[PDB]
Symmetry: C2
Amino acid sequence: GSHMEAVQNRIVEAAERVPGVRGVIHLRARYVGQDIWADMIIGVDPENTVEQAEEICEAVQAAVCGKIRRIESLHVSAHARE
Amino acid sequence: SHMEAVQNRIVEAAERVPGVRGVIHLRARYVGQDIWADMIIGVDPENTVEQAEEICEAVQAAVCGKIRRIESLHVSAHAREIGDTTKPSFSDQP
Ligand SMILES: [Cl-]
């Protein structure tokens, strides 16, 4: 509901502030008990290395998980984007 | 389960594709007679993202080409060091 959109907006806002992120392409978030499990795809520079893209991915994980307490599990991956 | 033969075929297939440093993970199930799968490959860290997506597509074509009962296969890549010998996982979500 309205409840869930608010958290999604929090997650996007958080992820999008992280340097190297070219928008959030996709976000699946779901309640499992009281906790949230999420899967996210970010856009990144096509010319990034895989190592570099994974660094950005981890940074997003820390930023999002840091600001939204109720997230128990967050997978982040990157697609090339312009 | 009973279906180790197909898993081994899938891994062997994927691992022959150039740019693949082993299969990190594979979730496969039968739906009727068809197989639906999700797979994670290891790749050169120094590959570009563009290039890793290219490898991913190559694996999709190679695996789906050699194991014809696969109706749907998603492939994604993580960086993997060359000294890594970690056996492929077949669980349901790391
Ligand atoms: Cl061949």
